[PDB]
mmCIF file of C-alpha atoms and ligand atoms in Angstrom:
data_model
loop_
_atom_site.group_PDB
_atom_site.id
_atom_site.type_symbol
_atom_site.label_atom_id
_atom_site.label_comp_id
_atom_site.label_asym_id
_atom_site.label_seq_id
_atom_site.Cartn_x
_atom_site.Cartn_y
_atom_site.Cartn_z
ATOM 1 C CA UNK A 772 0.000 0.000 0.000
ATOM 2 C CA UNK A 773 1.173 3.515 -0.821
ATOM 3 C CA UNK A 774 1.971 5.704 2.180
ATOM 4 C CA UNK A 775 1.691 8.746 -0.104
ATOM 5 C CA UNK A 776 -1.889 7.854 -1.090
ATOM 6 C CA UNK A 777 -2.779 7.180 2.545
ATOM 7 C CA UNK A 778 -1.316 10.464 3.822
ATOM 8 C CA UNK A 779 -3.159 12.372 1.074
ATOM 9 C CA UNK A 780 -6.360 10.686 2.282
ATOM 10 C CA UNK A 781 -5.660 12.191 5.717
ATOM 11 C CA UNK A 782 -5.511 15.684 4.220
ATOM 12 C CA UNK A 783 -1.762 16.111 3.718
ATOM 13 C CA UNK A 784 0.115 16.916 0.540
ATOM 14 C CA UNK A 785 2.769 14.215 0.184
ATOM 15 C CA UNK A 786 5.011 11.491 1.507
ATOM 16 C CA UNK A 787 8.318 12.132 -0.276
ATOM 17 C CA UNK A 788 11.805 10.699 -0.737
ATOM 18 C CA UNK A 789 15.273 11.878 -1.726
ATOM 19 C CA UNK A 790 16.715 10.365 -4.894
ATOM 20 C CA UNK A 791 18.808 11.139 -7.971
ATOM 21 C CA UNK A 792 19.634 9.754 -11.403
ATOM 22 C CA UNK A 793 21.825 6.812 -10.432
ATOM 23 C CA UNK A 794 19.282 5.672 -7.821
ATOM 24 C CA UNK A 795 16.546 5.696 -10.467
ATOM 25 C CA UNK A 796 18.597 3.435 -12.765
ATOM 26 C CA UNK A 797 19.680 0.891 -10.115
ATOM 27 C CA UNK A 798 18.073 -1.273 -7.488
ATOM 28 C CA UNK A 799 14.290 -1.158 -7.234
ATOM 29 C CA UNK A 800 14.150 2.542 -6.378
ATOM 30 C CA UNK A 801 12.220 3.741 -9.429
ATOM 31 C CA UNK A 802 9.496 1.115 -8.990
ATOM 32 C CA UNK A 803 9.080 1.889 -5.280
ATOM 33 C CA UNK A 804 8.963 5.654 -5.871
ATOM 34 C CA UNK A 805 6.410 5.220 -8.653
ATOM 35 C CA UNK A 806 4.159 3.140 -6.427
ATOM 36 C CA UNK A 807 4.572 4.561 -2.942
ATOM 37 C CA UNK A 808 5.844 8.156 -2.881
ATOM 38 C CA UNK A 809 4.408 11.411 -4.151
ATOM 39 C CA UNK A 810 7.352 13.836 -4.108
ATOM 40 C CA UNK A 811 11.033 13.544 -5.017
ATOM 41 C CA UNK A 812 13.924 15.634 -3.761
ATOM 42 C CA UNK A 813 17.475 15.766 -5.138
ATOM 43 C CA UNK A 814 19.854 13.865 -2.871
ATOM 44 C CA UNK A 815 22.843 15.853 -4.189
ATOM 45 C CA UNK A 816 22.193 17.222 -7.671
ATOM 46 C CA UNK A 817 20.964 20.708 -6.692
ATOM 47 C CA UNK A 818 23.512 21.580 -4.014
ATOM 48 C CA UNK A 819 25.967 24.359 -4.764
ATOM 49 C CA UNK A 820 28.984 22.061 -5.176
ATOM 50 C CA UNK A 821 27.080 20.139 -7.862
ATOM 51 C CA UNK A 822 25.474 23.077 -9.668
ATOM 52 C CA UNK A 823 27.934 26.028 -9.659
ATOM 53 C CA UNK A 824 31.458 24.625 -9.161
ATOM 54 C CA UNK A 825 32.925 27.723 -10.863
ATOM 55 C CA UNK A 826 31.442 31.185 -10.841
ATOM 56 C CA UNK A 827 28.499 31.846 -13.156
ATOM 57 C CA UNK A 828 29.021 28.427 -14.785
ATOM 58 C CA UNK A 829 26.203 26.002 -13.965
ATOM 59 C CA UNK A 830 26.020 22.167 -14.054
ATOM 60 C CA UNK A 831 22.374 21.106 -14.626
ATOM 61 C CA UNK A 832 22.573 17.592 -16.100
ATOM 62 C CA UNK A 833 21.776 15.732 -12.891
ATOM 63 C CA UNK A 834 19.030 18.083 -11.755
ATOM 64 C CA UNK A 835 17.424 18.127 -15.208
ATOM 65 C CA UNK A 836 17.214 14.330 -15.191
ATOM 66 C CA UNK A 837 15.392 14.282 -11.862
ATOM 67 C CA UNK A 838 12.940 17.028 -12.829
ATOM 68 C CA UNK A 839 12.153 15.295 -16.124
ATOM 69 C CA UNK A 840 11.640 11.924 -14.422
ATOM 70 C CA UNK A 841 9.295 13.459 -11.847
ATOM 71 C CA UNK A 842 7.190 15.197 -14.507
ATOM 72 C CA UNK A 843 6.934 12.032 -16.603
ATOM 73 C CA UNK A 844 5.777 10.051 -13.567
ATOM 74 C CA UNK A 845 3.382 12.565 -12.057
ATOM 75 C CA UNK A 846 5.419 13.371 -8.958
ATOM 76 C CA UNK A 847 5.891 16.632 -7.111
ATOM 77 C CA UNK A 848 9.423 18.034 -6.866
ATOM 78 C CA UNK A 849 11.290 19.701 -4.008
ATOM 79 C CA UNK A 850 14.269 21.927 -4.708
ATOM 80 C CA UNK A 851 17.515 21.381 -2.888
ATOM 81 C CA UNK A 852 19.068 23.900 -0.586
ATOM 82 C CA UNK A 853 20.150 27.094 -2.336
ATOM 83 C CA UNK A 854 22.184 28.796 0.405
ATOM 84 C CA UNK A 855 24.114 26.817 2.974
ATOM 85 C CA UNK A 856 27.700 26.349 4.058
ATOM 86 C CA UNK A 857 28.060 22.581 3.640
ATOM 87 C CA UNK A 858 30.647 21.596 1.014
ATOM 88 C CA UNK A 859 30.660 25.095 -0.442
ATOM 89 C CA UNK A 860 33.043 25.470 -3.391
ATOM 90 C CA UNK A 861 36.184 27.287 -2.294
ATOM 91 C CA UNK A 862 35.592 30.053 -4.859
ATOM 92 C CA UNK A 863 32.586 31.183 -2.826
ATOM 93 C CA UNK A 864 34.134 30.950 0.641
ATOM 94 C CA UNK A 865 37.126 33.084 -0.437
ATOM 95 C CA UNK A 866 35.004 36.129 -1.378
ATOM 96 C CA UNK A 867 35.429 38.938 1.145
ATOM 97 C CA UNK A 868 33.487 41.804 -0.475
ATOM 98 C CA UNK A 869 29.873 42.234 0.625
ATOM 99 C CA UNK A 870 28.534 43.503 -2.702
ATOM 100 C CA UNK A 871 30.242 40.715 -4.644
ATOM 101 C CA UNK A 872 29.015 37.908 -2.391
ATOM 102 C CA UNK A 873 25.498 39.368 -2.390
ATOM 103 C CA UNK A 874 25.517 39.356 -6.204
ATOM 104 C CA UNK A 875 26.931 35.813 -6.299
ATOM 105 C CA UNK A 876 24.261 34.569 -3.883
ATOM 106 C CA UNK A 877 21.438 36.279 -5.772
ATOM 107 C CA UNK A 878 22.710 34.940 -9.125
ATOM 108 C CA UNK A 879 22.886 31.391 -7.755
ATOM 109 C CA UNK A 880 19.336 31.566 -6.375
ATOM 110 C CA UNK A 881 17.843 33.230 -9.446
ATOM 111 C CA UNK A 882 19.524 30.963 -11.995
ATOM 112 C CA UNK A 883 18.401 27.713 -10.370
ATOM 113 C CA UNK A 884 14.884 28.890 -9.579
ATOM 114 C CA UNK A 885 14.322 30.378 -13.043
ATOM 115 C CA UNK A 886 15.408 27.210 -14.826
ATOM 116 C CA UNK A 887 12.681 25.187 -13.079
ATOM 117 C CA UNK A 888 10.190 28.038 -12.687
ATOM 118 C CA UNK A 889 6.700 26.713 -12.035
ATOM 119 C CA UNK A 890 7.829 23.076 -11.703
ATOM 120 C CA UNK A 891 9.040 23.000 -8.070
ATOM 121 C CA UNK A 892 6.531 22.984 -5.216
ATOM 122 C CA UNK A 893 8.921 24.079 -2.495
ATOM 123 C CA UNK A 894 12.508 25.260 -2.366
ATOM 124 C CA UNK A 895 14.789 25.004 0.644
ATOM 125 C CA UNK A 896 16.261 28.494 0.356
ATOM 126 C CA UNK A 897 18.464 28.713 3.458
ATOM 127 C CA UNK A 898 19.712 25.706 5.402
ATOM 128 C CA UNK A 899 21.605 25.063 8.634
ATOM 129 C CA UNK A 900 21.878 28.753 9.512
ATOM 130 C CA UNK A 901 21.760 28.268 13.312
ATOM 131 C CA UNK A 902 24.278 27.142 15.891
ATOM 132 C CA UNK A 903 23.144 24.679 18.557
ATOM 133 C CA UNK A 904 22.851 27.517 21.106
ATOM 134 C CA UNK A 905 20.450 29.401 18.810
ATOM 135 C CA UNK A 906 22.875 32.068 17.617
ATOM 136 C CA UNK A 907 23.388 32.427 13.874
ATOM 137 C CA UNK A 908 26.086 30.191 12.410
ATOM 138 C CA UNK A 909 29.186 32.139 11.341
ATOM 139 C CA UNK A 910 29.342 31.065 7.702
ATOM 140 C CA UNK A 911 30.843 33.081 4.847
ATOM 141 C CA UNK A 912 27.384 34.536 4.188
ATOM 142 C CA UNK A 913 26.953 35.792 7.754
ATOM 143 C CA UNK A 914 30.575 36.943 8.051
ATOM 144 C CA UNK A 915 30.676 38.911 4.784
ATOM 145 C CA UNK A 916 27.074 40.026 4.194
ATOM 146 C CA UNK A 917 25.773 40.037 7.770
ATOM 147 C CA UNK A 918 22.449 38.814 9.062
ATOM 148 C CA UNK A 919 20.614 40.491 6.178
ATOM 149 C CA UNK A 920 21.742 37.594 3.946
ATOM 150 C CA UNK A 921 18.665 35.613 5.051
ATOM 151 C CA UNK A 922 16.129 38.358 4.149
ATOM 152 C CA UNK A 923 17.949 38.983 0.849
ATOM 153 C CA UNK A 924 17.912 35.285 -0.039
ATOM 154 C CA UNK A 925 14.164 34.937 0.545
ATOM 155 C CA UNK A 926 13.237 38.181 -1.232
ATOM 156 C CA UNK A 927 15.325 37.130 -4.238
ATOM 157 C CA UNK A 928 13.731 33.672 -4.285
ATOM 158 C CA UNK A 929 10.190 35.073 -4.175
ATOM 159 C CA UNK A 930 10.931 37.271 -7.189
ATOM 160 C CA UNK A 931 12.473 34.393 -9.144
ATOM 161 C CA UNK A 932 9.465 32.065 -8.805
ATOM 162 C CA UNK A 933 6.371 33.370 -7.000
ATOM 163 C CA UNK A 934 4.681 29.943 -7.312
ATOM 164 C CA UNK A 935 7.171 28.153 -5.058
ATOM 165 C CA UNK A 936 6.854 27.736 -1.296
ATOM 166 C CA UNK A 937 10.052 29.026 0.307
ATOM 167 C CA UNK A 938 11.508 27.217 3.309
ATOM 168 C CA UNK A 939 14.226 27.667 5.903
ATOM 169 C CA UNK A 940 15.496 24.328 7.181
ATOM 170 C CA UNK A 941 17.626 23.080 10.040
ATOM 171 C CA UNK A 942 18.398 19.971 12.070
ATOM 172 C CA UNK A 943 18.209 19.248 15.798
ATOM 173 C CA UNK A 944 14.756 20.846 15.992
ATOM 174 C CA UNK A 945 13.428 17.584 17.429
ATOM 175 C CA UNK A 946 12.931 18.574 21.082
ATOM 176 C CA UNK A 947 10.774 21.445 22.294
ATOM 177 C CA UNK A 948 13.200 22.220 25.143
ATOM 178 C CA UNK A 949 16.328 22.386 23.015
ATOM 179 C CA UNK A 950 17.577 25.967 22.532
ATOM 180 C CA UNK A 951 17.820 25.800 18.740
ATOM 181 C CA UNK A 952 14.126 24.976 18.390
ATOM 182 C CA UNK A 953 12.939 28.110 20.185
ATOM 183 C CA UNK A 954 15.621 30.226 18.513
ATOM 184 C CA UNK A 955 14.454 29.448 14.971
ATOM 185 C CA UNK A 956 10.883 30.216 16.068
ATOM 186 C CA UNK A 957 11.986 33.560 17.526
ATOM 187 C CA UNK A 958 13.869 34.568 14.378
ATOM 188 C CA UNK A 959 11.278 33.352 11.862
ATOM 189 C CA UNK A 960 8.582 35.295 13.706
ATOM 190 C CA UNK A 961 10.737 38.418 13.517
ATOM 191 C CA UNK A 962 11.579 37.921 9.831
ATOM 192 C CA UNK A 963 7.932 37.382 8.882
ATOM 193 C CA UNK A 964 6.916 40.509 10.825
ATOM 194 C CA UNK A 965 9.408 42.378 8.630
ATOM 195 C CA UNK A 966 7.714 40.978 5.519
ATOM 196 C CA UNK A 967 10.370 38.381 4.669
ATOM 197 C CA UNK A 968 8.619 35.699 2.553
ATOM 198 C CA UNK A 969 9.372 32.594 4.615
ATOM 199 C CA UNK A 970 6.543 30.203 3.771
ATOM 200 C CA UNK A 971 7.824 27.170 5.671
ATOM 201 C CA UNK A 972 10.110 25.694 8.288
ATOM 202 C CA UNK A 973 11.585 22.329 7.314
ATOM 203 C CA UNK A 974 12.883 20.123 10.096
ATOM 204 C CA UNK A 975 15.776 17.889 8.987
ATOM 205 C CA UNK A 976 14.853 14.992 11.240
ATOM 206 C CA UNK A 977 17.731 12.616 11.962
ATOM 207 C CA UNK A 978 16.665 10.660 15.010
ATOM 208 C CA UNK A 979 18.217 8.161 17.370
ATOM 209 C CA UNK A 980 16.130 5.371 18.860
ATOM 210 C CA UNK A 981 13.362 6.693 21.094
ATOM 211 C CA UNK A 982 13.496 10.315 19.918
ATOM 212 C CA UNK A 983 10.298 10.101 17.855
ATOM 213 C CA UNK A 984 8.130 10.886 20.871
ATOM 214 C CA UNK A 985 9.691 14.323 21.320
ATOM 215 C CA UNK A 986 8.681 15.402 17.817
ATOM 216 C CA UNK A 987 5.063 15.371 19.023
ATOM 217 C CA UNK A 988 5.927 18.457 21.102
ATOM 218 C CA UNK A 989 8.650 20.016 18.917
ATOM 219 C CA UNK A 990 6.679 20.184 15.675
ATOM 220 C CA UNK A 991 3.753 22.179 17.159
ATOM 221 C CA UNK A 992 6.336 24.540 18.651
ATOM 222 C CA UNK A 993 7.883 25.074 15.221
ATOM 223 C CA UNK A 994 4.383 25.717 13.875
ATOM 224 C CA UNK A 995 3.889 28.504 16.445
ATOM 225 C CA UNK A 996 6.193 30.700 14.339
ATOM 226 C CA UNK A 997 3.181 31.240 12.089
ATOM 227 C CA UNK A 998 4.549 30.098 8.747
ATOM 228 C CA UNK A 999 1.884 28.827 6.319
ATOM 229 C CA UNK A 1000 3.618 25.422 6.221
ATOM 230 C CA UNK A 1001 5.985 23.180 8.115
ATOM 231 C CA UNK A 1002 7.466 19.905 6.920
ATOM 232 C CA UNK A 1003 9.550 16.966 8.092
ATOM 233 C CA UNK A 1004 12.578 16.614 5.825
ATOM 234 C CA UNK A 1005 15.397 14.099 5.368
ATOM 235 C CA UNK A 1006 13.817 11.726 7.867
ATOM 236 C CA UNK A 1007 15.707 8.691 9.123
ATOM 237 C CA UNK A 1008 15.604 6.893 12.458
ATOM 238 C CA UNK A 1009 18.405 4.736 13.836
ATOM 239 C CA UNK A 1010 16.975 1.243 14.306
ATOM 240 C CA UNK A 1011 13.821 2.147 12.325
ATOM 241 C CA UNK A 1012 11.528 1.344 15.240
ATOM 242 C CA UNK A 1013 7.832 1.399 14.282
ATOM 243 C CA UNK A 1014 7.138 3.411 17.437
ATOM 244 C CA UNK A 1015 9.579 6.155 16.446
ATOM 245 C CA UNK A 1016 8.317 6.358 12.860
ATOM 246 C CA UNK A 1017 4.641 6.354 13.874
ATOM 247 C CA UNK A 1018 5.262 9.122 16.409
ATOM 248 C CA UNK A 1019 6.811 11.302 13.696
ATOM 249 C CA UNK A 1020 3.890 10.629 11.345
ATOM 250 C CA UNK A 1021 1.359 11.465 14.051
ATOM 251 C CA UNK A 1022 3.191 14.707 14.846
ATOM 252 C CA UNK A 1023 2.613 15.612 11.188
ATOM 253 C CA UNK A 1024 -1.068 14.638 11.393
ATOM 254 C CA UNK A 1025 -1.573 16.652 14.594
ATOM 255 C CA UNK A 1026 -0.117 19.891 13.165
ATOM 256 C CA UNK A 1027 -2.526 21.490 10.697
ATOM 257 C CA UNK A 1028 0.214 23.389 8.855
ATOM 258 C CA UNK A 1029 2.435 20.307 8.410
ATOM 259 C CA UNK A 1030 2.097 19.461 4.712
ATOM 260 C CA UNK A 1031 4.129 16.272 4.521
ATOM 261 C CA UNK A 1032 7.121 14.136 5.332
ATOM 262 C CA UNK A 1033 10.177 13.214 3.269
ATOM 263 C CA UNK A 1034 12.378 10.217 4.098
ATOM 264 C CA UNK A 1035 16.105 10.377 3.375
ATOM 265 C CA UNK A 1036 16.290 7.564 0.850
ATOM 266 C CA UNK A 1037 14.562 4.322 -0.026
ATOM 267 C CA UNK A 1038 16.632 1.373 1.176
ATOM 268 C CA UNK A 1039 18.978 0.965 4.149
ATOM 269 C CA UNK A 1040 22.228 0.206 2.217
ATOM 270 C CA UNK A 1041 21.922 3.572 0.429
ATOM 271 C CA UNK A 1042 21.694 5.583 3.641
ATOM 272 C CA UNK A 1043 24.430 7.916 4.824
ATOM 273 C CA UNK A 1044 24.262 5.893 8.072
ATOM 274 C CA UNK A 1045 23.508 2.443 6.676
ATOM 275 C CA UNK A 1046 24.911 0.614 9.711
ATOM 276 C CA UNK A 1047 21.964 1.974 11.742
ATOM 277 C CA UNK A 1048 19.462 0.523 9.169
ATOM 278 C CA UNK A 1049 17.352 3.680 9.516
ATOM 279 C CA UNK A 1050 15.016 3.613 6.482
ATOM 280 C CA UNK A 1051 11.722 1.979 5.533
ATOM 281 C CA UNK A 1052 13.008 -0.661 3.058
ATOM 282 C CA UNK A 1053 15.736 -3.218 3.731
ATOM 283 C CA UNK A 1054 18.734 -4.244 1.632
ATOM 284 C CA UNK A 1055 16.554 -6.576 -0.448
ATOM 285 C CA UNK A 1056 14.012 -3.768 -1.056
ATOM 286 C CA UNK A 1057 11.408 -5.355 1.184
ATOM 287 C CA UNK A 1058 9.180 -3.062 3.268
ATOM 288 C CA UNK A 1059 10.267 -3.160 6.902
ATOM 289 C CA UNK A 1060 7.978 -3.299 9.941
ATOM 290 C CA UNK A 1061 8.067 0.498 10.241
ATOM 291 C CA UNK A 1062 6.614 0.825 6.733
ATOM 292 C CA UNK A 1063 3.686 -1.429 7.585
ATOM 293 C CA UNK A 1064 3.178 0.368 10.911
ATOM 294 C CA UNK A 1065 2.851 3.685 9.074
ATOM 295 C CA UNK A 1066 0.299 2.117 6.712
ATOM 296 C CA UNK A 1067 -1.795 0.917 9.645
ATOM 297 C CA UNK A 1068 -1.477 4.223 11.502
ATOM 298 C CA UNK A 1069 -2.710 6.176 8.483
ATOM 299 C CA UNK A 1070 -5.683 3.815 8.163
HETATM 300 O O1 6NT B 2556 13.904 16.165 2.250
HETATM 301 N N1 6NT B 2556 14.920 15.737 1.800
HETATM 302 O O2 6NT B 2556 15.260 14.410 1.882
HETATM 303 C C1 6NT B 2556 15.907 16.626 1.247
HETATM 304 C C2 6NT B 2556 17.027 16.092 0.633
HETATM 305 C C3 6NT B 2556 17.999 16.954 0.145
HETATM 306 C C4 6NT B 2556 17.809 18.325 0.305
HETATM 307 N N2 6NT B 2556 18.564 19.376 -0.059
HETATM 308 N N3 6NT B 2556 17.924 20.497 0.335
HETATM 309 N N4 6NT B 2556 16.771 20.172 0.944
HETATM 310 C C5 6NT B 2556 16.694 18.834 0.933
HETATM 311 C C6 6NT B 2556 15.726 17.975 1.421
#
């Protein structure tokens, strides 16, 4: 049974998965995505290292493949993070002039978003912008541009594609008493009051065993920032306990503004932490107990 169809029947938008070209041509990933998932996200092909490895010169082959595949198969598409610090090409991190870096950041956002204008439901515009204590992470963008880089990024994105839902995303937002969770709420509320077009908060949910229960309190707290949408992104759970996965799904169901959930791959051996077997399909592409528990919970 399709968890995407079942979550749509409960009033949500999608159950999604991260993938890319070489996943779609190997294993059983294409067949499982066709049957069971409603949105695809690029595992790597839209990050800055993959798309603009030298200035103004864009690499679109991998991203184009994914977008085409999704359109041919009737799937929604999420757009990978436009502005973050992870694996940034060195040409970006060596810029020290505020005007130049602002122009570079705007060009990167506008070029990607324009290419797929109208085809992408939601873009992760800024990612991983917070330290664990809730202060802003001192990346090249913060150091050179200042804290206005976040408003500028969102305003530029809204102009490039008004159809898309624009998200800020971060990890370790899984507990309502952790400082980072309240800090992103505080800042998103302030940005929205200033008219910054942040449509969503995306929670990059990488859980250890037993941490699913806390999402039932953290996700409503994230929703108190007043964004139109929230989502659960990049989900994986060490051990893949049914209890943990069902708790995350029910957090989504309980929060009216939570539009959907995306899991961080199809089958355990293709996870970035495969030794924790944290996904919904095993190494033979069989649905694991957590998959069936989600099916029953949604019924
Ligand atoms: O939800 N996702 O699995 C996901 C995967 C890669 C991404 N890059 N940016 N946002 C992302 C979300």
